[PDB]
Write a structure and sequence with these properties.
virus; about 50 residues; part of a larger assembly; little secondary structure; 2 chains; capsid; elongated; Major capsid protein; Major capsid protein (chains A, B)
């Protein structure tokens, strides 16, 4: 006869974007209408003592 | 007379495969029907994340 021993399937790790410490640089915020917008912007007033 | 003093037998220590620390690499198993089989095999399935 020709015996066959136990088969194995590879198991996967479950990473997430918030789990990583690289996310600390990120400040993600979902926005469902994101395709509709053109570009965001911010204005910064400054005056010099 | 040509005197003959004591005589000494050759005592010998006994070894075992389980006593060796090399057995830690081994996975000991017995299988009495081994003479019948040709070759075993192990199939492994793997997928890449």
């Amino acid at each position: 006869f020709e015996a066959i021993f136990g088969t194995f399937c590879n198991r996967l790790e479950w990473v997430y974007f918030l789990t990583s410490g690289l996310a600390a640089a990120a400040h993600a915020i979902k926005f469902h209408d994101l395709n509709k917008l053109t570009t965001g912007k911010m204005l910064f007033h400054v005056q010099v003592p």
